Design an enzyme around this catalytic site. Structure first.
Site, PDB file in Angstrom:
ATOM      1  N   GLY A 111      39.456  39.704  38.825  1.00  0.00           N
ATOM      2  CA  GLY A 111      39.852  38.074  38.331  1.00  0.00           C
ATOM      3  C   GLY A 111      39.193  38.151  37.733  1.00  0.00           C
ATOM      4  O   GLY A 111      38.618  38.594  36.862  1.00  0.00           O
ATOM      5  N   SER A 112      38.851  36.392  37.230  1.00  0.00           N
ATOM      6  CA  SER A 112      38.959  34.798  36.059  1.00  0.00           C
ATOM      7  C   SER A 112      37.012  35.755  36.683  1.00  0.00           C
ATOM      8  O   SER A 112      35.891  35.558  35.290  1.00  0.00           O
ATOM      9  CB  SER A 112      38.554  34.228  36.620  1.00  0.00           C
ATOM     10  OG  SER A 112      40.407  34.228  36.575  1.00  0.00           O
ATOM     11  N   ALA A 113      36.293  35.995  37.133  1.00  0.00           N
ATOM     12  CA  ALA A 113      34.500  36.706  37.422  1.00  0.00           C
ATOM     13  C   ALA A 113      34.059  37.604  36.318  1.00  0.00           C
ATOM     14  O   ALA A 113      32.688  37.331  36.190  1.00  0.00           O
ATOM     15  CB  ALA A 113      34.257  36.582  38.573  1.00  0.00           C
TER      16      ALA A 113
END
EC number: 3.4.16.4
Length: 326
Positions: free
Chosen positions: A59-61
Site C-alpha cells: 500500500g502507501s508504504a
C-alpha cells in the site's frame, strides 16, 4: 534471531497483543530494525512466522520510494507543484480521497499520500525502469534467512503490465513482500541512501550495503516524511512525543484466491525515528481487524507509536523537540 534485543522484543509482543485485542484481529506481526546496522531487534508474531512467510501488499508504504526515485533522478524537485485533480487511465479513475487540494508540491504529495501525485511521478519513468527499481529494492528477491516457508514476494514481469498497473503499483498494490522485506526497503531511506542486507546476528556496523539513492535524496525524503505524522498528515496516529517521526500507513483488502474481498483488510504502519538521525525502523501489521476500524493508521498507528516511543527510551535516545507530556 541472535540479533534480538529482548527488551524491545518484550515491548513488541505487549503492544502487538494490545492492538490485536482492541481491534479483535485475526493476527499480527511486528518487526523492529536497527536503522543503521540492519540488525533485527524484534520479530514478533501472534501464535507461524508471518514476518518472514507472509507476503503482503505494501500500500502507501511504497510511496516514499517512488517520490525518492523521482527526486533522485531529477524528474521532480522541492519546488514543483503538481495538479492533484482526478484523472483517468483509459476507463480507470485515479483520484485523491484524503484531502481537499487541487495541487500539491512534493512535500504535500508525501503528507497527504496523494495517489494522483505519486502515480504521476511514477509515470515519468518507463514501466521497465520501475520494474527494475522495485526489484532493486528487493521486491521478489529472497532474503535467505533460513526460516522455513520464507517468501520471495511477487513482482509481475513489466511486459505483462497495463498503464493502470504501473500506477496501481505506485500505490503499493499488485506487488507484494514480507513485512521483513518492507522494513529492509526502509533501510535505503534511513541509512543515507544505502540498502542493507539485514542481520539476524549481532553486528555493530553493517559491512556491505547497496546504494539506491544519493545521501542528499535520502536525507531530504526523511525530512519530508515527518509531514506524515505531524498535523495535516495521514499518519498522525503514529506521532511520538519529543521526536520527528518519518512514517507511512498501509491498508489493503485481503486476497483470498487471486481476488479481493471487500470486508476483510490488512492494516500496516511503518516508520523510523529520529527522522534526521534514525535509530530504529518499526513496522506493524494487524491482520483482519473486526473492531474500531481497519485503516493502517487506525489499527497499527497506536502500537507503532508505543513500540517506537518505548524503544527510543530503552535505547537511550533523548527527545529532539519539546515534549508536550510527561
Amino acid at each position: 534471531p541472535r540479533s534480538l534485543d529482548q527488551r524491545i522484543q518484550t515491548l513488541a509482543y505487549e503492544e502487538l497483543n494490545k492492538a490485536v485485542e482492541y481491534h479483535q484481529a485475526k493476527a499480527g506481526t511486528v518487526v523492529v530494525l536497527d536503522a543503521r546496522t540492519g540488525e533485527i531487534l524484534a520479530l514478533a508474531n501472534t501464535p507461524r512466522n508471518r514476518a518472514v512467510t507472509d507476503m503482503i501488499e505494501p500500500g502507501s508504504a511504497i510511496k516514499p520510494f517512488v517520490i525518492a526515485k523521482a527526486l533522485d533522478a531529477g524528474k521532480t524537485d522541492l519546488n514543483e507543484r503538481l495538479n492533484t485533480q482526478p484523472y483517468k487511465i483509459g476507463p480507470s479513475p485515479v483520484r485523491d480521497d484524503t484531502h481537499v487540494y487541487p495541487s500539491l508540491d512534493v512535500r504535500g504529495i508525501m503528507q497527504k499520500s496523494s495517489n494522483v501525485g505519486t502515480s504521476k511521478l511514477s509515470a515519468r519513468f518507463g514501466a521497465e525502469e520501475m520494474y527494475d527499481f522495485y526489484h532493486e529494492l528487493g521486491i521478489g528477491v529472497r532474503m535467505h534467512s533460513g526460516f522455513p516457508g520464507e517468501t520471495a514476494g511477487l513482482l509481475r514481469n513489466w511486459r505483462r503490465w497495463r498503464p493502470i498497473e504501473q500506477a496501481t503499483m505506485s500505490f503499493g498494490y499488485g506487488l507484494q513482500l514480507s513485512l521483513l522485506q518492507l522494513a529492509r526497503a526502509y533501510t535505503a531511506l534511513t541509512h543515507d541512501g544505502v540498502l542493507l542486507p539485514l542481520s539476524f546476528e549481532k553486528q555493530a556496523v553493517a559491512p556491505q550495503g547497496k546504494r539506491i539513492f544519493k545521501e542528499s535524496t535520502a536525507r531530504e525524503v526523511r525530512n519530508l516524511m515527518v509531514s506524515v505524522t505531524e498535523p495535516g498528515g495521514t499518519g498522525t496516529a503514529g506521532a511520538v512525543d519529543g521526536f520527528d517521526v518519518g512514517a507511512k500507513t498501509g491498508t489493503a483488502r485481503k486476497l483470498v484466491n487471486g481476488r479481493y474481498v471487500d470486508n476483510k483488510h490488512v492494516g500496516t504502519f511503518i516508520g523510523f525515528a529520529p527522522a534526521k538521525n534514525p535509530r530504529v525502523i518499526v513496522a506493524v501489521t494487524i491482520d483482519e481487524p473486526t473492531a474500531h476500524g481497519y485503516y493502517g493508521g487506525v489499527v497499527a498507528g497506536s502500537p507503532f507509536k508505543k513500540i517506537m516511543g518505548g524503544s527510543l527510551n530503552i535505547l537511550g535516545i533523548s527527545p529532539t523537540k519539546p515534549l508536550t507530556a510527561a
